[PDB]
Write a protein that binds this DNA or RNA. Sequence first.
RNA 1: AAGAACCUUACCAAAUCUUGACAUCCUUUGACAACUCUAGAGAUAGAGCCUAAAGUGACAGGUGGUGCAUGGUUGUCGUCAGCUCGUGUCGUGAGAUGUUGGGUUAAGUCCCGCAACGAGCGCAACCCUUAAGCUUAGUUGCCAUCAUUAAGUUGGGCACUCUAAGUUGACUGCCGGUGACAAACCGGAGGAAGGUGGGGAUGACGUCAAAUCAUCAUGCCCCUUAUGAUUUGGGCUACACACGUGCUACAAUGGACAAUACAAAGGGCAGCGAAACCGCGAGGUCAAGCAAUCCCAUAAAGUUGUUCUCAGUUCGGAUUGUAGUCUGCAACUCGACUACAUGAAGCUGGAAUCGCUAGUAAUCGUAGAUCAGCAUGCUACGGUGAAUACGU
Lengths: 202, 60, 127, 80
Amino acid sequence: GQKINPIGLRVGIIRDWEAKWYAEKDFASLLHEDLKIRKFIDNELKEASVSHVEIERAANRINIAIHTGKPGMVIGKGGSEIEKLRNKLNALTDKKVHINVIEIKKVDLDARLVAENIARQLENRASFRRVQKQAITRAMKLGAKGIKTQVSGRLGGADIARAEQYSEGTVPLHTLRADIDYAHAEADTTYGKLGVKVWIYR
Amino acid sequence: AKTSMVAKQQKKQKYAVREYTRCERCGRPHSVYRKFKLCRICFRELAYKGQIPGVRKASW
Amino acid sequence: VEYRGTGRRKNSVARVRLVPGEGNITVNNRDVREYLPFESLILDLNQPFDVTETKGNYDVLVNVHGGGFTGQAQAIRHGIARALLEADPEYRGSLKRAGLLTRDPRMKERKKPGLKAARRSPQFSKR
Amino acid sequence: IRIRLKAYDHRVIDQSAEKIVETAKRSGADVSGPIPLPTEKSVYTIIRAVHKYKDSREQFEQRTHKRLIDIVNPTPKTVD
RNA sequence: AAGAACCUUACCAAAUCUUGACAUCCUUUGACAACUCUAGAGAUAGAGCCUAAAGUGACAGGUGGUGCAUGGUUGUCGUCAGCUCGUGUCGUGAGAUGUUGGGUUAAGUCCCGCAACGAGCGCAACCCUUAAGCUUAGUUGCCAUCAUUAAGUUGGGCACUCUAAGUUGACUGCCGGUGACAAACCGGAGGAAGGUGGGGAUGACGUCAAAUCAUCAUGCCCCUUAUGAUUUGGGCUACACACGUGCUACAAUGGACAAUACAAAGGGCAGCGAAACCGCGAGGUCAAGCAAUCCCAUAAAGUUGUUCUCAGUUCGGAUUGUAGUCUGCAACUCGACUACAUGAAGCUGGAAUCGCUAGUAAUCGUAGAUCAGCAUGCUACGGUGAAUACGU
């Protein structure tokens, strides 16, 4: 059961890439600055509702746009953190080309917002199935499918590793255009290093 | 084997001191300059006919 | 592309794996001038080759199948001839004067039952 | 300039081929466009470090997908 | 092992500082002991220099086994050609045809009447390979419509080939071909593409802990001036070798060693070579370019040595020891190359086992995932690549 859902070759007609820039010599350098600016925005995002990235630095228009779901206090009360982001990006290198924001329609479509309401109780080793049976029905009301509760070992609070087969729905992967979210994310809260086999789909 | 040498340049695995940082897209790894991802040979061709303000003569 | 060439000569089809560039023709993977039993015209064994103008521009490195003592000879020439047709369309128009497609309108008749050669018969046996 | 264009995937190189034609169009000089690059590569599998079934080194592929779009006569406004 | 010496040895006799080489803290202050010096084999540690270090206690560094208790599955019998589920259908209880009938490709299942219907992810493809003709480029690429043509081509983007750096036609679908009620896929001109282009990739749910504190998480474990640790008296190779594995010389239907004509996968600002430095060799060149090139090209056969002659002979990449390479400090008490000498047994072979299809299995050429001492095993594709089916 290594169902990884090869989306890499599945996307490319609707789901391109987050970073876009015309390069080949500045590619590695541009990619080096991409992760360099991602080491400060990830600590400022505080696990925000970010679906994709709008880093379109092609045609001399470099801008590290961050979705961050709905504009809350992340940008500051009236863009008060946008002026403080200048030095933030100025401390890294010398970019700071006015990063923009994007209003994400249907915020509960990624596997981050669904893991912040049904997988947020797993941090205190609590409900990991009762609350994991929910949200998929809410995702069905939105128009999509949702996530599928799954595990390979350490089932909730137990010293004995146990698997599962609670797949509420299937996942289409026989097509070469199928669009799948597949937003993987784990947290090490004094539990140990382990991998899960959770399956998601648009 | 230039395509295989231009592909494996910054491969990071168990040992990141195995990959050798050289000309990003061009060649001539030696007899140039490497520190801010810009080889003389490549930069010269990338600044051919005065492109990005980089290839100059002197003027103090 | 000049491999899998179809060339039949008096019941002697033979495929040829000719390669563009290298011209190392080694029939039976060795000498082809002291192999053919007879074949008096060893240099004139390739009539279309002269018009093809690719003598030293293709390496045979193939073989011969069936045929007779000298019937197996002059069969790879047509085998590479059909291979050159797929290798270049100019060859077809370059060999419009000759255009060798079929050169086996009959077979070999010898001892047979009833009739001498199933066509002729004995007539006034010389004394 | 005779410089290549190594992006990420196929559409990543497709959007980089049209974005380089836009920046080159800004400058007042001859600009190119589509660039023939016939597909040609290979693949192979081995082992990784820990446990991860087949297909060692979790990566897309060893494809050498690149480009060759650039400028011919670069001026002072060719930087943008 | 992402490769057994020594820094890594994380074994013990160990030393020596043992709230510690320690991984880390509030505290000061010579900020380091980089700088001289001390027990020095040495971190650790003591005035002095620009005037982590004095560190209690919070706290260490650590290889004895498992796994029949579970994880990441190292792998494994199996990637079986199959597992599936209500429903309609009913047991005193193990109850479903779930695919059901023409019947074709490489795709658990083409629709004669078949309790009627639905199983999900793999299985045809979806990931990958790619076009000979040519778009490209005509650039490190050779040339017909064009030659001063430096394999760093110095040209003319001079003429386009065999061309690289996104794929394409194509493949089932009528196909020439009739199943008899009945398609079709094979393959006929099919195009170079014998038909998923040729093809592969593919790890379906699993099973065995078989393996893993010494592959780690751990039900978690094993030392507490010693199992650590700055590291020497010193290590698992050198003695009878008990095996698998490392090439090997057993021969004249031929040996080591001449010059040597012709792809390579990959190696490289310190490193590759045309008569030259390096042509028996293990190496002591700075270095033209400095990576489509340039270097291996002093590679290879259909086109070549030599020579000693039913054998110890110029046939023996074993041991052994002064000694040159690789490392020489722990080899005094742990590896090797070919030689200044020693150069064994060895004439097709043990207990017992292993191996065979015209650009590839193999093979002249031949390759590393790489440790400060073992490259002598298959390991990359231009051409030597010569050979291909009584029998179901």
